């Protein structure tokens, strides 16, 4: 029930490295060249640093600041570019009638190149959640019909099926294969993620995409 511990564990405040710097050691530091100093700070913030340790840490702190500062502008610029390239894209109709689609893989080649291994849960979710099945899928004695919007439970089911070897990829409607002019159709887009239900016709999904991609731009290190 220690304060730092409770805050870190609950998710209220703090991560392991910050806690470590408070209680353990400050650790290794970089030179202004990116090169790392051989001698780490053995002191924590509790114990207090020496002036030399503080000065050595300043290089890294400053580099971090300059990095952030230079990152916000490139991120804003990128966002404006994305907005200008996507702005006309709107959900204009219910269904373009395409029979084209993409296949989202549930497995990926390992770096060992030994075989294929199941992709991470979050990745599969980010590729499947709220999407419309482009073909009938039959797994674990369950029918997932063509035209079905994949709920999170459907995704988890598909993951289970993949683990049992019943499926390696999922046929899905996608903006990539949508044949709607100047936009996408409802089926190829899938869920309005903010409402966990099919997207309303008229939604400016291009703008939403640009913002969705641009927003975490300043978190990318």
């Amino acid at each position: 029930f220690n304060p730092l511990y409770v805050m870190a564990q609950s998710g209220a405040r703090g991560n392991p490295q910050q806690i470590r710097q408070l209680c353990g050691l400050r650790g290794l530091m970089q030179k202004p060249s990116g090169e790392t100093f051989e001698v780490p700070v053995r002191s924590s913030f509790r114990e207090g640093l020496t002036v030399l340790e503080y000065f050595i840490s300043s290089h890294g702190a400053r580099k971090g600041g300059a990095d952030t500062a230079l990152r916000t502008a490139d991120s804003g610029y990128l966002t404006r570019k994305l907005v200008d390239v996507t702005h006309e894209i709107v959900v204009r109709e219910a269904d373009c009638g395409t029979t084209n689609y993409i296949s989202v893989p549930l497995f990926q080649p390992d770096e060992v190149t030994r075989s294929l291994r199941l992709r991470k849960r979050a990745d599969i979710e980010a590729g499947l959640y709220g999407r419309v099945l482009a073909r009938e899928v039959e797994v674990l004695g369950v029918r997932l019909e063509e035209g079905r919007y994949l709920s999170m439970d459907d995704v988890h089911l598909l993951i289970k099926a993949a683990e049992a070897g019943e499926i390696q990829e999922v046929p899905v409607r996608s903006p990539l294969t949508c044949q709607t002019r100047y936009g996408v159709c409802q089926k190829c887009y899938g869920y309005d993620l903010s409402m966990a239900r099919p997207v309303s016709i008229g939604e400016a999904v291009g703008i939403v995409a640009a913002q969705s991609i641009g927003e975490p731009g300043t978190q990318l290190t």
């Binding site: 200008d84 702005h87 980010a126 100047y182 008229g202 400016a204 991609i213």
Partner: protein
């Protein structure tokens, strides 16, 4: 994004990437007025090709093209959008020479003219919807009924 612990759905990135693959390059004009090496929209060349095919002509041989978001944005059909983006001079000169007509399809063009954007409540799919109470509706239905 995954590396940074950011959760982002694939379909947004797919929207953008689809915008990056919007254009093609002519490898052979065929029975068309197009030129070899001419860059145009995939949609337009496919429409042209189905038109020539339905006419019994030779379709246009085209190669897929990839371009970055900047160039794709500048290569758009709408001169207002492009000019308001950047390279204003270039865009305006080419559009002026071509006598280009902006059909106000997207959001920026409409924003510039202060029009109602073709999205949300301004979508053609919803903005013509009417509302009427049953009293008024019946009072109208009787007027229709007597004529």
């Amino acid at each position: 994004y995954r590396a940074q612990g950011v959760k982002l759905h694939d379909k947004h990135i797919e929207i953008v990437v689809r915008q990056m693959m919007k254009y093609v390059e002519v490898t052979d004009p065929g029975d068309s007025r197009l030129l070899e090496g001419q860059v145009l929209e995939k949609w337009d060349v496919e429409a042209l090709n189905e038109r020539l095919i339905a006419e019994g002509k030779t379709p246009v041989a085209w190669k897929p093209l990839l371009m970055g978001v900047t160039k794709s944005a500048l290569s758009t059909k709408s001169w207002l959008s492009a000019a308001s983006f950047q390279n204003t001079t270039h865009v305006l000169t080419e559009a002026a020479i071509a006598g280009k007509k902006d059909e106000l399809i997207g959001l920026k063009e409409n924003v510039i003219l202060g029009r109602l954007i073709p999205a949300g409540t301004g979508s053609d799919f919803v903005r013509f919807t009417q509302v009427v109470d049953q009293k008024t509706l019946k009072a109208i239905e009787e007027a229709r009924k007597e004529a």
